Design a protein around this ligand. Structure first.
Ligand SMILES: Nc1ncnc2c1ncn2[C@@H]1O[C@H](COP(=O)(O)OP(=O)(O)O)[C@@H](O)[C@H]1O
Ligand SMILES: Nc1ncnc2c1ncn2[C@@H]1O[C@H](COP(=O)(O)OP(=O)(O)O)[C@@H](O)[C@H]1O
Ligand SMILES: Nc1ncnc2c1ncn2[C@@H]1O[C@H](COP(=O)(O)OP(=O)(O)O)[C@@H](O)[C@H]1O
Ligand SMILES: Nc1ncnc2c1ncn2[C@@H]1O[C@H](COP(=O)(O)OP(=O)(O)O)[C@@H](O)[C@H]1O
Ligand SMILES: Nc1ncnc2c1ncn2[C@@H]1O[C@H](COP(=O)(O)OP(=O)(O)O)[C@@H](O)[C@H]1O
Ligand SMILES: [Mg+2]
Ligand SMILES: [Mg+2]
Ligand SMILES: [Mg+2]
Ligand SMILES: [Mg+2]
Ligand SMILES: [Mg+2]
Lengths: 371, 371, 371, 371, 371
């Protein structure tokens, strides 16, 4: 049967069938519950909503993400999300289809173990596999050598790979991503008098961020330009028809990727983390890593982020090293695309964790068979 | 057995059987007692009259409303009114029929408790329920989303509802309604020399208000027009054949709904209260609330009130928000119609307060089972 | 035992038994005493005569009415009249029969008190009651709603009643009646040279008034007609065979009912008093009062008085109000007829003032039990 | 020039010059016309009399009040009264003197308009102003906070004022005053056999009321005392030397102020109206209103009325609220005194309606410039 | 010269001279305007009132707070309030005195900019500074380490400070404070039939809240106790002498601080917000933050709030962490006291924004010099 691929990200579920070129089910990994008084009977209204229904009814619901920082924190809501993905979005019987899952590196192993247990015992899949997202992204690029910067929401991580060999000691992880950016934007929007507090307003601010925010090539020059003139100001219409105008916040928001101190984090910026990951690697592969910086994830979709990244890594790296940033279109889905490629490889069909192997070894099997 | 529905309003009793499309008993919630010397014996004249008999004999009686501002203030007369409703108007035995009652929101809970106690112990109904009028009105509209402006006499209230969920913190109540309008009309009619003092004359003035008063689309322009010409003047014939002519009073009377200061109230107008109720609600539902302003009650029957309301809420709300006022015909009875729909719903048959539950918990049960 | 009914009017005693359709004793409430020298002995002639004997012997007697303006002014002669009524006319023992008396409204209460005392202590009746004449007249009409214009001699009064309830504040009394008319006719008859001075001549003039006088529909037109031609002149034969011819005096006499200024009174006419009584009443009952103007008493027996009254009240009342004058035949006796009906009502048998109650409370009891 | 002040009351004209401490012209607002045959020529007798001449000649005249219930009903006689006031009593040329008039609240605006027109076009005054009587009374008290009970004849009204701000929505008016009391006394005097019918006899009864009537502190106890003993009976000598004795009528007459039902009115008593006026006002000012109940007008001059009022308002108001009744001597004239104070204020000289403003705007100007 | 300190809170102005131990001017930051008809001239009454005069005359005024949620929304009324503070309360010339102002964190920067502009251009102060209130409160405690919970009306905020260093990323703000509590109390008081609608009645309800409300140590146990017995019921006397009895409302009102859902807010309670602020901070300082929870503001003055806070934070925090709540007396004024200490520090005299610096850089200077 055709394998399932579910890139169960912190913010969005990307799910589909292996061999397809894009996921057919993309929806927020969010579960919503009503927070207000139900007064009208006979309406068949439910006590829990998931995905696009939660977004549509968000004004009446409290929205909660069961996965935070790439770590599943609410297993009942995660099970509800997976059940939705299988039965309502894909409209498939999971017991027929091998399912390829994925997770960020340096994650708690109990998360992987419980994922395997739920997949095998609740949804009764015949086979399962858990891949590291950056490896799938590198699969999607068609390459075998490169350092992948994957950044969705929740977690940002770098994985250097050379000739198909990963350097796990050089893997670097940063718990700073699109959700932290959304929260920071909510914070700084208070400077202009716009107050966004609720989770639905957090979704509104996320939409604002996606639509209007961009990465400054030179942060101080852009700040001076915004102080000088209104040329950078943009207007956004709220769901109730109220219009807000956003200025330097547009690039101050993503700047926290390069200056995590804006949100009080001591961590080095994304560029310095990439450079340090490269420098932890053997000297001989660094040139090829410099030329194959692969960007992945939704938070790499900010306009100008590739140019800024190239500039900073060029400033860090020795002269005459050829810094190249590969930021292809549709890199939002590169993890899922690589998962589809991998799951459809003939050589991969022996890598699956089978129901038999799980019945023998239990959920510990993932630590043996999965990277 | 078929459930009874009694919309026990401050001015009118609307009563009937669930499943019917209209109440079969509509009469004033008024009790009249003779105020003059009874000289002729053998006439079988009674010491108390209720409803239409009180209206017909009003010239000899003192008329009193047992319910004021949606609050029952005279429980003996209210009991007499309910007894009339059951035995003389509906001609039914209340002990056979579940009775759905209703009341305005933010009412004293002792009123609901005493209502339940009287229903269960005096009329010995098998089951009872107390619904909020605006929810019933929304039921009558066939909708599940909207902000209901209900205005009879005694109380005006707004209840926002989205997807069947009420926002009680956004519920707004205004103790300004048709009875205050009737009193104000009585006051301003003195300007032309017409003196109405007695309760029967208050009923006469109420009839004048119902027949001739209307809402100006632009109050100052209408005032200028009335000063300029007699085109707006209308004549009304009193019961004794005396003819009175009414001019700008026609629209000054209902204008107090939009300018409560005319009667010394500090409250904002009906339109500003609706807008504030909307703005207290979550930003995401405001658009749908703007499009589903449902008008209910007799005091929403003034000609032009819907257009005025749309104009004012459009002036308040952001541009490009689609303000729509749903003022259907027969909105006098929308509360009762919704009560009939609700009482006849299969899913509602478990919501009833049973005589058993009352015998266990006492009159406090309504606070648990009723919204 | 069968109750007695005595309509003790100022001019005529109307007495009989309750349940009968007419009084069997009708005679003038007059006491006559000889004013001339008694020369023949052995004749058994009496020193006092009452009623029809006084009328027959009037030429030798001085005639005095013990009741003036509805007020008993000579209690010894009133006692003689009552004794005559009981023992000689009805030929009954008063101690066996409850006696219903009546009086005009707004009378001195001492008159009622002394009446009660005389009835209980002199004639020793077992029970007694004092009714207001207009209420009895309304009883006789078979109605329960209407404004009664009662006019005998002595007093004219209006009592509005609606649904059995009297409006005492709207009760109006006018001390202008048939005796004032008789005196005015005596005055104006001097214009043609006819001098009537004595009390017996006053009785003659009363007979002239009763037989020949009428109410002009339009007073000025009738005056012009009488000036133009003799068509309106009528002849009357005096007891001594002298013939007198009467012209415009025929309608000038009763015109004083509508123009009391003819006798120097400042009071408004009978029609204006009826209208003012109606207008003092609640607006809601005025229409029914307009349609139920009940005329009662001997001075309402003038030909054309009903048409004149309808014309004037129509001129006063608003157009489209249906003015109706109920002037039934035998309205001379309507007060007595109503008294008979009332006294024979089963529900009235508890209204009697008993000898026991009088022995307890004294003559003050009437103010408590009687309207 | 010195301003004129004319408190044109329903019963009495109080007129004088601003700055004086009392009106120099006090006379009845009454016009008398002869009702009898003028037989003697060469006597120079007039066809119309006004004020004190009408009172002196009242026995020959029909007396009419051109103002009823505070409303001018006969403008020709009102013009005659004003002409008398100006030319014969004050002996002044009105075209030289600004004239401050006053009227009861909630009066027909046409009355004020016609007053202004007559003042400006007939008497050609240079300036005019119409003040509300209770405000002037409060001016006379020297206060700026209080609820004024003004009661002359025709109209009784309450005006609450706090810190110079009136609460017009709490203004209450009652068309029950000294003339209704005089009529009721005329009615009940018939109980003792005293008949007063004519307008001159109405003036006699008014004098009786003023001299002998008083307010019972406890009505039922006084009734029992009057029934028990003659101690409360008083004698009054009529103009013809006839002596009448009055008993409980003395306090039954003014009791109608507290029990309007005695004359068939449905209205609450004077005390309940004052309390309701207070309770219609903002909670924060009620304490100061309770302590500053100002009594004004001739019908507040009954002995004991202040004590009765204090007792009743104390019975109504919460305990520990300090009820105080300010009933100063000469409160008959407090309205005029306040008018004099106001008219002589420097700050008021801009409030006048000038002949120029009237020539521009016409009689409508009063509705703009006058409260 | 001595520096001025003005803690311009949302509800109360606390103003005084630096170096003093308490503010000498404490009055409500409220501006009142008359809403009723001014009828009495010559009284010198003003069109606007501020502070204690507005409170005293509140029954005639409409009261408006120019600052809402710590944000100045009406700059003209705020200017009037500051002018009052300087000239009438402190009776000082502001151009002579450096003025230290303060505001809540995460406020719009335009509010601070306009404050600076008004201070420098309208009141022409020589120097100015804007401090964050919680830092001043920590100054008042004498500490340099701690997490300050400041709650007046309008805004509640937490600021963690360690060794004089603030963690702005851990600063948390909640727009739920005493005014929301007052509104909620007004809402729930309707359950017992007490209706408070007007702004003056809102002030009455605020006084009720301050006097009678308290924080339950265990909310459900207190609810059960209130249901069981009247022991918790308290009586309050309204200004008009009406007495109201309050029961479980006493602790339901402040419970909304711990359960914001009572007013429909999605926010976590005050205790959970404090814990989350601590947990956002570096692990090493959390122990000292746990031991130095400083409570500030008027809404921290509820009896039992400190014990409840300690209980909840102990329930949240790990065992053996020493939770300590520092709720000193006079914490109403701790912000002002700290401002006085800071303004009187020698080292602070270089921190002032001078008129020179403002004339150079304009109102943007505050963003540079002020935290
Ligand atoms: N055009 C855009 N610009 C900036 N950020 C974006 C854009 N589109 C999506 N994002 C961000 O990408 C994140 C989701 O990326 P995704 O790869 O789905 O992460 P995950 O794998 O954790 O679900 C969201 O936090 C969203 O705000
Ligand atoms: N055509 C009309 N125009 C204006 N007002 C009306 C009209 N018909 C009824 N009303 C008013 O509606 C009120 C009664 O409405 P209703 O919904 O019965 O209120 P309740 O539920 O309190 O009885 C009355 O006060 C009446 O004056
Ligand atoms: N046909 C008539 N036309 C005019 N007047 C009449 C007629 N018959 C009787 N009357 C008058 O009616 C009066 C008696 O009416 P009555 O009802 O007996 O009065 P009372 O009740 O006072 O006795 C007399 O004054 C008499 O003149
Ligand atoms: N001593 C008194 N006792 C009772 N009533 C009085 C007394 N003096 C005057 N009145 C009444 O006061 C009324 C006149 O009061 P006034 O203030 O002149 O009224 P207005 O302003 O309408 O003329 C009269 O009706 C009179 O009967
Ligand atoms: N004893 C008390 N109990 C409860 N609340 C109080 C008490 N005293 C004052 N308050 C509340 O504190 C608030 C004012 O506190 P304050 O520190 O002045 O706030 P701000 O700084 O915003 O003016 C008011 O909303 C008031 O209701
Ligand atoms: Mg991702
Ligand atoms: Mg209704
Ligand atoms: Mg008769
Ligand atoms: Mg007066
Ligand atoms: Mg504060």
């Amino acid at each position: 049967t055709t394998a399932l691929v579910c890139d169960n990200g912190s913010g969005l579920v990307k799910a589909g069938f292996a061999g397809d070129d894009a996921p057919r089910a993309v929806f927020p990994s969010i579960v919503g519950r009503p927070r207000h008084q139900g007064v009208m009977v006979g309406m068949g209204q439910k006590d829990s909503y998931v995905g696009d229904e939660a977004q549509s009814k968000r004004g009446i619901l409290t929205l909660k993400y069961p996965i935070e920082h790439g770590i599943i924190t609410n297993w009942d809501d995660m099970e509800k999300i997976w059940h939705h993905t299988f039965y309502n979005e894909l409209r498939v019987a999971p017991e027929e289809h091998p399912t390829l899952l994925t997770e960020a590196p340096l994650n708690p192993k109990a998360n992987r173990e419980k994922m395997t247990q739920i997949m095998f015992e609740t949804f009764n899949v015949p086979a399962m596999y858990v891949a590291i997202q950056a490896v799938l992204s590198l699969y999607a690029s068609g390459r075998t050598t490169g350092i992948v910067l994957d950044s969705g929401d929740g977690v940002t991580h770098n994985v250097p790979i050379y000739e198909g060999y990963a350097l796990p000691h050089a893997i670097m992880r940063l718990d700073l991503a699109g959700r932290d950016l959304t929260d920071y934007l909510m914070k700084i929007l208070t400077e202009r008098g716009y107050s966004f507090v609720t989770t639905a307003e957090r979704e509104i601010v996320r939409d604002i961020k996606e639509k209007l925010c961009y990465v400054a090539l030179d942060f101080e020059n852009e700040m001076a330009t915004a102080a000088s003139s209104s040329s950078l100001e943009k207007s956004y219409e709220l769901p109730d028809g109220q219009v807000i105008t956003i200025g330097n916040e547009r690039f101050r928001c993503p700047e926290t990727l390069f200056q995590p101190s804006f949100i009080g984090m001591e961590s080095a910026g994304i560029h310095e983390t990439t450079y340090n990951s490269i420098m932890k690697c053997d000297i001989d592969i660094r040139k090829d890593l410099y030329a194959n910086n692969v960007m992945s994830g939704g938070t790499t979709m900010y306009p100008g982020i590739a140019d800024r990244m190239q500039k900073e890594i060029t400033a860090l790296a020795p002269s005459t090293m050829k810094i190249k940033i590969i930021a292809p279109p549709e890199r939002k889905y590169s993890v899922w695309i690589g998962g589809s490629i991998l799951a459809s490889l003939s050589t991969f069909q022996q890598m699956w964790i089978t129901k038999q192997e799980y019945d023998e070894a239990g959920p510990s099997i993932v630590h043996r068979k999965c990277f």
